Amino acid sequence: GAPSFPFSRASGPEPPAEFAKLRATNPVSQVKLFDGSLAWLVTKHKDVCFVATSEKLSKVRTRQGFPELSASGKQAAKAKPTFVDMDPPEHMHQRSMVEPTFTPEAVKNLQPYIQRTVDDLLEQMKQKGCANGPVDLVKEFALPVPSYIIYTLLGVPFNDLEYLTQQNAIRTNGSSTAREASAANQELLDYLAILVEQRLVEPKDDIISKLCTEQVKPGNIDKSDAVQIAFLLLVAGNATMVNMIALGVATLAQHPDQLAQLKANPSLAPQFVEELCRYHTASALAIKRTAKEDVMIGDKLVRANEGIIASNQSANRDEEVFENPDEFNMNRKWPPQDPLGFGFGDHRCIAEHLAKAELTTVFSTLYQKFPDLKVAVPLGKINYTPLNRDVGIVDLPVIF
Ligand code: HEM
């Protein structure tokens, strides 16, 4: 029978072993989801791009055969959708309401603020020190950098950042009870609703205010929609950002020649970030569709109302695109084809430029501030996310 999916990672920092075998012998195959239903799994870079762009495929989760991967996903699919789950024309109708903050030009103009945020958190880490033992690079740095930035862009005032960063972390922490995670989720929604009310009365220079002035007041969306769009922008990428920062530090510890390169030349940070986003595809479960009509993919017929999962993680290890794909090599010569860490097509991560700027700022600054930063536990004992989840690191003891 069809194997259960998601697959488990082969070890803490490695992709599932199944993908390499599937790319070689069965690149479009059926898998069994948590509820016993079947879905198609696509593993080659070319086919992942096809799935991401075909207008014969839908992200609408109320369609028959949509590949929800858990009971919580089936429950979430009942809610009113935001643009992440929309097809044209609704998708860009709503996404364009918030895209301006995320353009290359806007993200370039944000660079001094990104740098200040990273610098301030590094200085707080220095002042706290590690004189009594290792400290957790996740809690002290990888968590607040993306959290403070997206909260600030949305419109949260500075004094509220630390508490709301902690609450949003509780939401997804693997140690939280269900009650604890649900209470933190509702606290974030309650806070955002009050912020939307405030910005309807007195808008400021932030994303929520722009939604209020330009879409809520004119009746293009309502205020509960504005809350949900803001919430999507917070929760869609934050855990992935935290994991990418921590994975970057661990990857450099595992590759000491490349770390020494980066310590000696911070202008290598962009190249490092490109290879990191290919090699550790920390969001690998989001390119999902159902077929609106029959569609042929490779040697398979995907029938109408059948589900599809396109693994951008597998695509990023596709030997036919990336030479020596399972080596981390920030000095590689890149091919014509895009790495797919941020997806592809109309739904490609709205925050791709922001995320790369955050990551480039982190890795061009971290080892200037802390040239002796070391992972404090043996690398084989790093606390990775559980193997049946997206790759990530829960906590990362360091000294400096
Ligand atoms: C290194 C960090 C990140 C990675 C690797 C990442 C990756 C991804 C991927 C793989 C997708 C799916 C794209 C597709 O459907 O083809 C996506 C979509 C999305 N991401 Fe991210 N992301 C990151 C950071 C962020 C951040 C910081 C935000 C918000 C500020 C964000 C918000 C979103 C949203 C809203 C979508 C849905 C876009 C749409 O369907 O139109 N992501 N991201």
Numbering used by the authors: 4 to 403
Excerpt from the paper describing this PDB structure:
P450nor is a heme enzyme that catalyzes the reduction of nitric oxide (NO) to nitrous oxide (N2O) in the nitrogen cycle (2NO + NADH + H+ → N2O + NAD+ + H2O). In the resting state, the enzyme has a ferric heme with a water molecule and a Cys thiolate as iron axial ligands. In the first reaction, the water molecule at the sixth coordination site is displaced by NO, forming the ferric NO complex as an initial intermediate.
As the X-ray dose was increased, the NO orientation became more bent (158° → 147° → 122°) and the Fe-NO (1.67 Å → 1.68 Å → 2.10 Å) and N-O (1.15 Å → 1.19 Å → 1.42 Å) bonds were elongated, as seen in the synchrotron structures. The X-ray-induced structural change was localized at the heme–NO moiety, and there was no appreciable difference in the protein structure (root-mean-square deviation of Cα < 0.1 Å), which suggests that the photo-reduction occurs at the heme–NO moiety.
